[PDB]
């Protein structure tokens, strides 16, 4: 709910993206003008910058974002010459503000306050905090001017997708928690309806979105597509879609089969349980594949993944996720243990002779030209001597 | 590998050891199935035991 | 000193052998001059038995030199966090750069013949992707100085020498078609890393030289540490020479592009970046003058550092002149509304006072002429 | 303990004594019949000195119980072969080993 | 069971088994010789040798079995040899003396166009042998501790038989390719040729092939070029790109052999020529001395040569390339002509000194590479890179020698055995660069470091050590373990402690070693943010060793590095130690122990050879004042209690438990907070005193020196220094009956703390007034002198406090009184 001036990697993430919304529908895409009132929307959360009588400067919900609270303007200078009003124009209007070049002060229209930074609170710089809370002040500072920087179409599309997908999956998780522990017996599911169709379509769309580039492509095109894919994976992970997918997987994993799920959600919902689980695992694999940063996140919760290898509904998908993690992350390789290796071998024992399991087995043996002697020894001692 | 040499009896319908692979580790002869009964000097061979 | 009398004939045979190997490599092998670059490029640029193979296909297969350039382009385009140092790329970039020679009264005919020879030598490379390769390598360096970017800049200068309009057109088309901010981001980072005169470094170097020779030269380090003041002056000159050659001949399109890249998501003003570097250099030179103003005569090392700084400043002035000449009115306005006037004021102060000071001792006539 | 079962007779008189170098050709199997070692695969007789604790205890006793030129089957219990630890990656824990040894010569 | 040849049609089983072979290769990859020995029980030598020859085996299985043989038996030896193949340590033996650039031939003994066959002849560069052990699974298992047993060797396989088999298979493959059958072994030409070529390349690099074998391989590659003074050669057959890649590997090996031969010929000539030069210089000296002084000036000018460093003498004696008179270069004309002839021969060998049939290795490689590139648009980037590397080496042969010489080195015959042992140890250390560190690897690294530091060649040939790059490899190992889990308490502390003991000594061996380590200062300072809990040597200690008592390096130091260290010190002055908090110490709010380490690195940079380096001292003082938290909570402007109050509070903390430590212990509670605080402030005062300017600068009245001294005087009051110097020390006493009540030196106020105060007082404030001298003597010095004198009894004479008092008096106090 709070707004900050922050620097560093955040300048490439989706939490620093804002949509400028003039107070009109017609010609809302016209050139922006000095002193023209407008709203500022946070893309990934859908909230609006505004002034609240209690909390000061915050981002409010759209339901509470009335013009008085959330109407701002851009000013060339802090002089008190805003008296001169202007009328709207039926057209693109005259170009006034430029990307990068123009330096603009943000003013709250109703109160006349200026968007500035709060006096840096002590002990925060001492700890190492380098973000300054933003506030609305009567005077401000001389360096209050902001520069407007353009973002790529891919970034803006990803931000809007994150917003809608987060909404949908949060609704799904709430639906599951609604009947978390309430058996239906023979009556109605005893909960809120689930967005099964929306979830399935969204998962398919995101799998296609994160599809890796085709191998039969010219090197240059493949490299550009790989760069775009990595950037999109990073954007989603930073906005926290990985945790959301894992939470959905947890809630659906509580149930051991479609019939067990139907005992709480109903037969109609249970008709899609297996499909949703498999799609979630495919999305997880697409989200982490080839991404060292995303894959390294499993070094803390490897048991979460290894303990699911013997689930029969999505065995191949779970194995694919594990394969991606081990292929990309040496950190996971350095925390693998004997029980993990034994579970992976029991996969061979219980599911049959699958070469992907061997591929996984010595994705543990070497990574990036460095060998893990403990993993090699454990595999040798637990797999070979039985013959 | 130790030389194989066994002597005994075999039943016409059923004793068909083909060259190459087979029961156990291959090299099937007299007493490597339940259709033949063999002796090798130290062991009585039948059923591949 | 004298009484110690350390003779070579007393050294053990193996110590003498190692010393001999070092000295022989330094004086005989290293000094040897072998010119194989032209022969190598000429051999590699030849297709073989094309008619016998019946290459009636409209798209002929690349010849060996083309394939080498394509391989290095692929290496540059590979998506990586950083560009790894590559001895092979550096060696072949040096070979390609040397292949374009850039060689009394010379007749108009002889001058034109030299120009045509250089154009042919440069076409040998830029007809096979060398210009795009240079741009890709500059972009891939991601603003990190080093041998890779030095070799890339030298190759670019070699293929651009004389204001090669065809190479300029190819570079501009590639940049405007790819629309990547990485190239100019890398250029800006390199320009910001470029160094100026440093008086603390100068005093440190003076003290290091002052440190005497007590033990024998082998045991001591001979205080032969590389130059501490403007150590990358060659790289700075190469960078600004490359930027100048991008505009040589009053290429209006590329002159405008250096100021604003309309198609990209963000733009960098290379003209203003150059002005900012010039301002830093002017301030450093003013500091040097103030350091030496009290002294009567500038010593040899001070003269050498002044000369290096002045060569860099000369190159920067030539780059700005190339940016604006033609005239590029947009660049003229961008410079007029910049910090150039302050740099010129500081330079005028330094010029006046250094003129008056250097005129008073004839041992500094060369420095005065350079000034 | 180790049990020795003759396969082919030896000379009957020449037995190894402590400090002698026995030269043997052997094939090792686990009790279930899985081969894990054989000197004949490497085509080189295995030499070991009796009494220097170079080989397992079962071997030390069984080969000493044999005569020159003799071939015998040695059945060795786990405590005599490798015990609980086993041979990591080769022999499982608590494994009984069956060997087919032949004492080629004594030196 | 079935025949394994049924996997040609049973494709699921074939895929599973090929991936099983890959898993076998991977569980033993990168030096796991123990697992290789284990795998010898699952795929035995007879199986591997039969698979090598099985012509009906499906291609993936054939390739897998060739790769499995290589991984089990040859990979480790090949890697270790390949690591050493880039260095040329030539012993000065008769074989080396015999080596010559060109083969002794009827045309000429040196000069003739015809080279010797590459890779054939005599080479003397030192290369440690291969070590293998026999596979055997009936031996008694070593029942000693784990991770301490000697590292397993690679399982052995008969190498002469393997060589013969590889050669025969390669010959058969060449013949079959020439015949162009429709059933290639393995199902394709690539599957027929790539495995055998990989095996041959591995054996070649291992260097097991004899001269006759190498001649056979050369004739298989090119019958006409490498004829000895069928007709289709591999290089002239039409082959896939992978086969071309293996051919490139073979050509690379032979080009490397040519380079090695050039290096060794140069070394042999160097031996002979240097002997001649020394012998001539001896005669010249004898004749010069024998001269009855024609002219004293002439004698001095002549002896100017002989009173010069030997390297400079050699440079002068070799300066006749473009002619020189007997005064510029006294070397005789015959001796000059010898070098001229050898230089011509070397240029001719490299091809610099100047038929469609190649007739030479260089021309063969150039023609082959250019022809391949002309014939096809090569699709494999690895093949392209190998092709153009080979072509560059062929075209620039003198440059290859120039870039290789830095790694060449001649040694005496008496150093060969120790050099071989050192090379084995360095090989083990280098092998540890591709494996995650564990207990066994840690033990191996420590043992190798100990052996190297006990080897004589380590000390006598620091230039050889630098050429081998020992310091860089050890640094890389140390930094790998440090960075791995940087936030987590780093594991294997003993290995890092050894990582100095080695490197932190390597710096001290020689000045060039010190410079080489100094070149990595930022790296060490980057990784020095962690430590302390080391309780041993650290990368910060490596950094100090690089700049210690070296004026040139201290002047070459960088303001960026000093700012990095000062930032670490600020962090230590603002935050408590997480490790101490975990161990249960009170939270005092800062980190005196780390602050002390950082102050210590700064002290070495500021003061060199008993004098302050003004350039570094001013920078350090300015950084410290710009970050006041670096002075500790006592010297804070607002809430500061002052230095004297800080020391007194530290004494009270030491006296009171439950504030000095956890109060719950290997080194008697490890850290004591009171002593830590006192030590931090002592180190800070020592650093400031050492940053104080010199008396000659003060006398000359330099503005900067005066300003710096004024700043230091403002930081530290004189009354606080006198008070600390006057604080009483706890002296050993005899209580009860024979009870020596000795103070715990590591937990109390010690004279080492007063020594820093004395240094600061003498360097910054200085004693110049008789009244002040008498006052300080009466209050601070005389009581300590009397205590030290009274502790001279036989019982107390050797107590820790008595020895500390003696050191304090003889290093700080008495010199000052002598000066005053």
**Secondary structure (DSSP) of B1-49:** -PPP--EEEE-TTT----SS--STTS---TTSSTTEEEE-SS-EE-TT-
Paired with A75 in beta bridges are A105
CB-CB under 8 Å, E32 with A355:
no
Quick check: is D48 catalytic?
no
- Chain D residues near residue B42 by CB distance under 8 angstroms: 7
Q: What are phi and psi of A201, to 5 degrees?
A: -65, -40
Write down how long chain E is: 820
Mark whether D and A touch (3+ CB pairs within 8 Å): yes
Chain E interface mutation, best of D24, D40, D90, highest count of E Cβ atoms under 10 Å: D90
Residue found by looking up tokens 């050498």 in the block: C304
Q: What are phi and psi of C328, to 5 degrees?
A: -90, 105
> What is the enclosing helix (H) or strand (E) of E49?
helix E45-53
Q: Which of D7, D32, D48, D56 is catalytic?
A: D56
Strands of E52-163 (E only): list them.
88-91, 132-133, 154-155
User: Residues with Cβ < 8 Å from C258, sequence gap 6 or more?
Assistant: C243, C246, C247, C270, C271, C323, C331
C150/C72 Cα distance (integer angstroms): 16
* Chain-centroid distance, C-alpha E119: 30
Q: What are phi and psi of A4, to 5 degrees?
A: -135, 155
E101/E350 Cα distance (integer angstroms): 10
Mark whether B and C touch (3+ CB pairs within 8 Å): no
Paired with E154 in beta bridges are E132
C371/C351 Cα distance (integer angstroms): 7
Residues 8-47 of D with CB under 8 A from B: 27
User: Residues with Cβ < 8 Å from C94, sequence gap 6 or more?
Assistant: C37, C151, C154
**Inter-helix orientation angle E59-69/E11-27, to 10°:** 10
The C-alpha of A374 sits at a distance from chain C's nearest C-alpha, in angstroms, of 30
- Resolution of the coordinates, Å: 2.6
Closest CA to E395 of E351, E357, E346, E344: E351
Strands E88-91 and E408-411, bridge-based pairing: parallel
D3/C118 Cα distance (integer angstroms): 92
Method: cryo-EM
C27/C231 Cα distance (integer angstroms): 25
- Local structure of residue D55 (DSSP, 8 states): B
Q: Which of D46, D76, D82, D91 is catalytic?
A: D82
* Dihedral sign of CA atoms C190, C193, C199, C205 in order: negative
Task: Confirm if C28 and E341 have CB atoms less than 8 A apart.
Answer: no
Q: What are phi and psi of B8, to 5 degrees?
A: 175, -150
Quick check: is D79 catalytic?
no
The torsion of the CA quartet E30, E35, E41, E44, rounded to 10 degrees, works out to 10
Closest CA to C40 of C91, C114, C102, C86: C91
User: Residues with Cβ < 8 Å from D77, sequence gap 6 or more?
Assistant: D1, D2, D58, D96
Q: Which stretches within E135-240 are classed as H helix?
A: 159-179, 189-206, 211-221
Q: What are phi and psi of E248, to 5 degrees?
A: -60, -40
Task: Confirm if C163 and C245 have CB atoms less than 8 A apart.
Answer: yes
Residues of chain C in Cβ contact (below 8 Å) with chain A = 74, 77-79, 265-267
Q: What are phi and psi of E570, to 5 degrees?
A: -60, -45
Breaks in chain E, after residue numbers (C to N greater than 2.5 Å)? 229, 354, 664
E305/E706 Cα distance (integer angstroms): 47
User: Residues with Cβ < 8 Å from C271, sequence gap 6 or more?
Assistant: C258, C259, C320, C323, C331, C334, C335, C338
C39/A247 Cα distance (integer angstroms): 66
Task: Confirm if E560 and E522 have CB atoms less than 8 A apart.
Answer: yes
Burial class (CB in 10 A: 0-12, 13-18, 19+), B27: middle
- Ligand-binding annotation for C322, yes or no, is yes
User: Residues with Cβ < 8 Å from E243, sequence gap 6 or more?
Assistant: E189, E190, E193, E194, E197
Q: Which of D7, D11, D36, D79 is catalytic?
A: D36
Closest CA to E92 of E402, E408, E414, E335: E414
The C-alpha of C315 sits at a distance from chain E's nearest C-alpha, in angstroms, of 28
Quick check: is D7 catalytic?
no
Residue found by looking up tokens 């775009």 in the block: A228
Burial class (CB in 10 A: 0-12, 13-18, 19+), C232: middle
User: Residues with Cβ < 8 Å from A328, sequence gap 6 or more?
Assistant: A288, A289, A290, A291, A292, A295, A296
The C-alpha of E631 sits at a distance from chain A's nearest C-alpha, in angstroms, of 15
**Per-residue b/e over E192-226, b at no fewer than 16 CB within 10 Å?**
bbbbbbbbbbbbbbbbbbeeebbbbbbbbbbeebb
- Chain E residues near residue B24 by CB distance under 8 angstroms: 1
Closest CA to E813 of E783, E790, E771: E783
Structure-block tokens of residue C17: 């052998």
Task: Confirm if E102 and E108 have CB atoms less than 8 A apart.
Answer: yes
Paired with E410 in beta bridges are E90
- Ligand-binding annotation for C248, yes or no, is yes
Task: Please measure the distance between the N-terminal and C-terminal CA atoms of chain D and give it in whole angstroms.
Answer: 26
The C-alpha of A338 sits at a distance from chain C's nearest C-alpha, in angstroms, of 34
- From residue A283, give the alpha-carbon distance in Å to each of A56, A204, A244, A270, E153: 40, 8, 11, 20, 46
Structure-block tokens of residue A359: 């591929």
Structure-block tokens of residue C277: 């570097």
A236/E204 Cα distance (integer angstroms): 51
Q: In 3-state terms, what secondary structure has residue E661?
A: coil
E400/E406 Cα distance (integer angstroms): 11
Structure-block tokens of residue E209: 């092939």
Mark whether B and E touch (3+ CB pairs within 8 Å): yes
- Chain D residues near residue A387 by CB distance under 8 angstroms: 34
* Chain-centroid distance, C-alpha D62: 7
B32/B46 Cα distance (integer angstroms): 6
Task: Determine contact: E46 vs chain B, CB below 8 A.
Answer: no
E82/E630 Cα distance (integer angstroms): 50
E137/E37 Cα distance (integer angstroms): 9
> What is the enclosing helix (H) or strand (E) of D30?
strand D21-30
Closest CA to D86 of D56, D59, D64, D107: D56
The torsion of the CA quartet C78, C84, C90, C93, rounded to 10 degrees, works out to 20
- Local structure of residue D38 (DSSP, 8 states): E
């Amino acid at each position: 709910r709070l707004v900050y001036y922050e620097g560093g990697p955040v300048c490439t993430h989706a939490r620093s993206l804002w949509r400028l919304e003039p107070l009109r529908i017609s010609w809302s895409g016209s050139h922006l003008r000095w002193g023209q009132p407008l709203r500022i929307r946070h893309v990934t959360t859908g909230r609006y910058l505004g002034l609240t009588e209690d909390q000061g400067l915050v981002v409010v919900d759209a339901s509470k974002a009335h013009t008085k609270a959330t109407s701002f303007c851009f000013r060339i200078s802090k002089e008190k010459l805003d008296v001169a009003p202007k009328r709207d124009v039926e057209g693109m209007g005259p170009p006034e503000i430029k990307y990068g070049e123009s330096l603009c002060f943000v003013q709250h229209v109703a109160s006349g306050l200026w968007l500035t930074y709060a006096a840096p609170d002590p002990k925060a710089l001492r700890l190492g905090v380098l973000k300054k809370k933003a506030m609305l002040h009567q005077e401000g500072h001389m360096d209050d001017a902001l520069s407007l920087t353009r973002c790529q179409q891919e970034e803006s599309q990803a931000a809007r997708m994150i917003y809608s997908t987060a909404g949908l999956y949060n609704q799904f998780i709430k639906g599951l928690d609604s009947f978390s522990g309430k058996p239906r017996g023979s009556g109605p599911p005893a909960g809120s309806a689930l967005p099964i169709e929306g979830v399935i379509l969204s998962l398919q769309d995101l799998i296609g979105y994160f599809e890796p580039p085709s191998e039969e492509l010219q090197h240059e095109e493949k490299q550009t597509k790989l760069r775009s894919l990595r950037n999109r994976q990073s954007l989603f992970q930073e906005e926290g879609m990985l945790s959301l997918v894992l939470n959905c997987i947890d809630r659906l994993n509580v149930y051991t089969t479609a019939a067990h799920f139907a005992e709480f959600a109903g037969e109609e919902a249970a008709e899609s349980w297996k499909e949703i689980v498999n799609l979630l695992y495919e999305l997880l694999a697409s989200l982490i594949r080839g991404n060292r940063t995303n894959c390294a996140l499993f070094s803390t919760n490897l048991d979460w993944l290894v303990s699911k290898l013997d689930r029969l509904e999505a065995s191949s998908g779970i194995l694919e996720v594990l394969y991606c993690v081990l292929i990309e992350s040496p950190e996971v390789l350095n925390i693998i243990q004997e029980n993990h290796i034994k579970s992976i071998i029991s996969l061979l024992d219980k599911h049959g002779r699958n070469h992907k399991v061997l591929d996984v087995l010595c994705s543990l043996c070497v990574c990036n030209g460095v060998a893990v002697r403990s993993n090699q020894d454990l595999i040798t001692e637990n797999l070979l001597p039985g013959r | 590998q130790a030389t194989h040499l066994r002597v005994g009896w075999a039943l016409s319908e059923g004793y068909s050891p083909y060259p190459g692979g087979g029961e156990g580790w291959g090299g099937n002869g007299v007493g490597d199935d339940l259709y033949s009964y063999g002796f090798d000097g130290l062991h009585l061979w039948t059923g591949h035991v | 000193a004298c009484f110690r009398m350390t003779p070579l004939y007393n050294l053990p045979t193996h110590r003498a052998c190692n010393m001999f190997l070092e000295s022989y490599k330094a004086s005989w092998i290293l000094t040897e001059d072998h010119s194989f670059e032209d022969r190598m490029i000429d051999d590699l640029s030849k297709a073989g038995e094309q008619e016998e193979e019946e290459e009636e296909v409209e798209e002929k297969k690349p010849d060996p030199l083309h394939q080498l350039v394509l391989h290095f382009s692929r290496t540059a385009l590979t998506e990586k966090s950083k560009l790894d140092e590559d001895y092979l790329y550096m060696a072949y970039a040096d070979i390609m750069a040397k292949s374009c020679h850039l060689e009394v009264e010379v007749s108009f005919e002889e001058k034109e013949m030299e120009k045509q020879r250089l154009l042919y030598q440069q076409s040998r490379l830029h007809n096979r992707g060398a210009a795009e390769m240079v741009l890709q390598m500059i972009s891939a360096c991601k603003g990190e100085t080093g041998a890779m970017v030095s070799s890339t800049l030298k190759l670019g200068i070699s293929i651009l020498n004389g204001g090669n309009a065809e190479v300029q057109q190819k570079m501009l088309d590639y940049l405007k078609d790819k629309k990547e901010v990485g190239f100019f981001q890398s250029i800006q980072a390199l320009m910001q890393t470029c160094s100026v005169l440093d008086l603390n470094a100068f005093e440190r170097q003076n003290k290091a030289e002052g440190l005497g020779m007590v033990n024998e030269d082998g045991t001591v380090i001979n205080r032969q540490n590389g130059e501490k003041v403007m150590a990358d002056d060659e790289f700075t000159q190469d960078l600004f020479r490359f930027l100048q050659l991008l505009c040589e001949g009053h290429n209006n399109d590329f002159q405008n592009y250096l100021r604003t890249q309309t198609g990209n998501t963000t733009t960098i003003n290379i003209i203003i970046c150059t002005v900012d570097y010039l301002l830093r250099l002017q301030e450093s030179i003013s500091d040097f003058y103030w350091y030496y103003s009290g002294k009567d005569v500038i010593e040899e090392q001070g003269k050498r550092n002044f000369s290096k700084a002045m060569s860099v400043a000369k190159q920067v002035f030539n780059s700005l002149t190339e940016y604006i000449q033609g005239p590029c009115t947009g660049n003229q306005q961008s410079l007029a509304h910049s910090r150039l006037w302050d740099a010129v004021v500081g330079f005028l102060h330094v010029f006046a006072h250094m003129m008056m000071k250097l005129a008073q001792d004839s041992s500094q006539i060369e420095l005065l002429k350079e000034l | 303990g180790v049990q020795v079962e003759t396969i082919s007779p030896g000379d009957g008189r020449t037995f190894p004594k402590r400090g002698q170098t026995c030269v043997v050709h052997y094939t090792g199997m686990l009790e279930d019949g899985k081969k894990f070692d054989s000197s004949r695969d490497r085509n080189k007789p295995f030499k070991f000195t009796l009494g220097k604790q170079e080989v397992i205890r079962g071997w030390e006793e069984g080969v000493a119980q044999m005569s020159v030129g003799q071939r015998a089957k040695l059945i060795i219990s786990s405590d005599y072969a490798y015990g609980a630890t086993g041979h990591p990656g080769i022999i499982p824990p608590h494994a009984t080993l069956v060997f087919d040894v032949e004492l080629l010569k004594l030196e | 069971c079935m025949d394994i040849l049924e996997l040609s049609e049973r494709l699921d089983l074939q895929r599973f088994h090929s991936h099983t072979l890959s898993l076998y290769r991977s569980v033993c990859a990168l030096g796991n010789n123990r697992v290789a020995h284990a795998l010898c029980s699952h795929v035995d030598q007879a199986q591997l040798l039969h698979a090598l020859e099985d012509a009906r085996l499906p291609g993936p299985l054939r390739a897998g079995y060739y790769d499995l043989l290589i991984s089990i038996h040859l990979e480790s030896a090949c890697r270790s040899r390949r690591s050493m193949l880039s260095e040329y340590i030539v012993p000065l033996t008769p074989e080396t003396r015999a080596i010559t650039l060109f083969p002794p031939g009827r045309s000429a003994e040196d000069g003739p166009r015809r080279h010797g066959l590459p890779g054939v002849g005599v080479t003397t560069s030192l290369r440690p042998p291969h070590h293998f052990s026999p596979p055997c699974f009936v031996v008694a298992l070593p029942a000693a501790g784990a991770t301490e047993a000697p590292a397993r060797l690679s399982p052995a396989i008969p190498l002469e038989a393997l060589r013969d088999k590889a050669l025969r298979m390669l010959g058969e493959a060449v013949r079959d390719g020439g015949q162009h059958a429709r059933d290639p072994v393995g199902g394709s030409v690539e599957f027929q040729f790539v495995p055998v070529l990989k095996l041959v390349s591995t054996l070649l690099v291992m260097g097991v092939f004899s001269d006759e074998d190498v001649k056979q391989i050369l004739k298989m590659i090119e019958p006409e070029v490498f004829r000895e003074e069928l007709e289709e050669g591999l290089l002239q057959m039409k082959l896939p790109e992978s086969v071309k890649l293996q051919m490139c590997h073979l050509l690379e090996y032979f080009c490397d052999q040519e380079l090695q031969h050039r290096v060794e010929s140069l070394a042999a000539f160097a031996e002979c020529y240097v002997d001649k030069m020394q012998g001539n210089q001896r005669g010249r000296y004898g004749l010069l001395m024998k001269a009855f002084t024609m002219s004293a000036a002439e004698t001095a000018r002549r002896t100017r040569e002989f009173r010069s460093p030997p390297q400079e003498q050699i440079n002068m004696l070799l300066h006749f390339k473009n002619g020189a008179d007997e005064e510029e270069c006294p070397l005789p004309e015959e001796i000059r002509q010898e070098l001229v002839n050898f230089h011509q021969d070397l240029l001719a060998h490299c091809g610099i000194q100047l038929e469609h049939k190649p007739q030479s290795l260089q021309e063969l490689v150039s023609h082959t590479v250019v022809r391949w590139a002309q014939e096809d648009f090569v699709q494999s980037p690895e093949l392209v890179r190998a092709m153009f590397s080979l072509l560059h080496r062929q075209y620039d042969g003198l440059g290859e020698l120039l870039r290789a010489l830095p790694r060449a080195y001649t040694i005496s015959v008496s150093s060969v055995e120790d050099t071989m042992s050192l090379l084995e140890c360095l090989g083990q250390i280098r092998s540890l660069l591709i494996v995650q560190m564990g207990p066994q690897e840690e033990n191996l690294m420590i043992q190798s470091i100990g052996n190297i530091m006990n080897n004589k060649v380590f000390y006598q040939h620091p230039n050889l050590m630098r050429a081998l790059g020992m310091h860089e490899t050890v640094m890389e190992v140390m930094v790998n373990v440090l960075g791995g889990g940087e936030s987590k308490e780093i594991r294997f502390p003993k290995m890092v402690t050894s990582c100095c003991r080695f490197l932190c000594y390597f710096c001290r061996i020689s000045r060039q070693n010190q410079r080489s380590m100094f070149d990595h200062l930022s790296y060490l300072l980057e990784n020095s943010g962690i430590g302390l809990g080391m309780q041993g040597s650290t990368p910060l200690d490596v950094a100090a060793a690089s700049v210690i008592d070296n004026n040139e390096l201290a002047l070459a130091l960088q303001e960026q590095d000093l700012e990095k260290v000062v930032s670490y010190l600020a962090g230590c002055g603002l935050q408590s130690c997480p490790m101490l908090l975990a161990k249960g110490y009170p939270d005092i709010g800062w980190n005196p122990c780390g602050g002390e380490r950082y102050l210590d690195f700064l002290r070495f940079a500021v003061f060199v050879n008993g004098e302050s380096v003004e350039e570094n001292a001013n920078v350090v003082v300015r950084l410290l004042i710009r970050k006041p938290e670096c002075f500790g909570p006592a010297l804070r402007g607002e809430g500061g209690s002052g230095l004297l109050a800080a020391i007194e509070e530290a004494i009270r903390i030491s006296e009171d438990p439950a504030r000095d430590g956890p109060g719950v212990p290997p080194e008697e509670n490890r850290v004591h907070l009171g002593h830590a605080i006192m030590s931090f402030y002592a180190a800070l005062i020592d650093l400031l005193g050492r940053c104080a300017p010199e008396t000659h600068l003060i006398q000359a009245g330099k503005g900067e020196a005066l300003r710096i001294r004024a700043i230091l005087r403002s930081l530290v009051p004189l009354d606080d220094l006198v008070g600390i110097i006057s604080l009483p020390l706890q002296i050993p006493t005899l209580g009860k009956d024979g009870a020596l009540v000795q103070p715990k030196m590591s937990a109390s106020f010690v004279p080492d703390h007063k020594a820093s105060m004395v240094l600061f007082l003498d360097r910054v404030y200085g004693i110049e007034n008789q009244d002040f001298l008498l006052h300080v003597l009466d209050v601070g010095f005389l009581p300590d002198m009397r205590a030290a004198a009274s502790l001279d009894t036989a019982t107390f004479s050797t107590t820790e406090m008595a020895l500390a008092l003696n050191r304090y008096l003889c290093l700080a106090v008495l010199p000052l009184i002598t000066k005053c």
